[PDB]
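Quick illustration for those who missed Monday's session on complexes.
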Amino acid sequence: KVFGRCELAAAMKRHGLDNYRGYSLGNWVCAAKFESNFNTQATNRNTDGSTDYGILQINSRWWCNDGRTPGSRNLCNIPCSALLSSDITASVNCAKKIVSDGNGMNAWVAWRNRCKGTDVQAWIRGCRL
Ligand SMILES: [Cl-]
Ligand SMILES: [Cl-]
Ligand SMILES: [Cl-]
Ligand code: NA
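Prediction with chloride ion bound:
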């Protein structure tokens, strides 16, 4: 599923991401835009052999099991394929564990390089929330 901007904002707010660990909703929408272009089915392979999955590009070396990343830790206790669903619940629940890990949203390289320090409220402007 490819979300619309406001549709994704509303879904993330319903799943408790707005101001989660102090990160306003615009931060999460911005991260999803540049990680996946709002596409729940996005996958990308990393140089170390791990793969990133879903709307927030969660990595198989630490967070989910894809059966082909040796020595991976599966900290969200899910198959990585569950992160590609049109239902974003699994991605949101795992993202909450990632952002609580000590480094905040800096875990998402696209957020650090393209969202951090910008006017992220622009990403929810006009939305009925
Ligand atoms: Cl915001
Ligand atoms: Cl990740
Ligand atoms: Cl933080
Ligand atoms: Na893993």
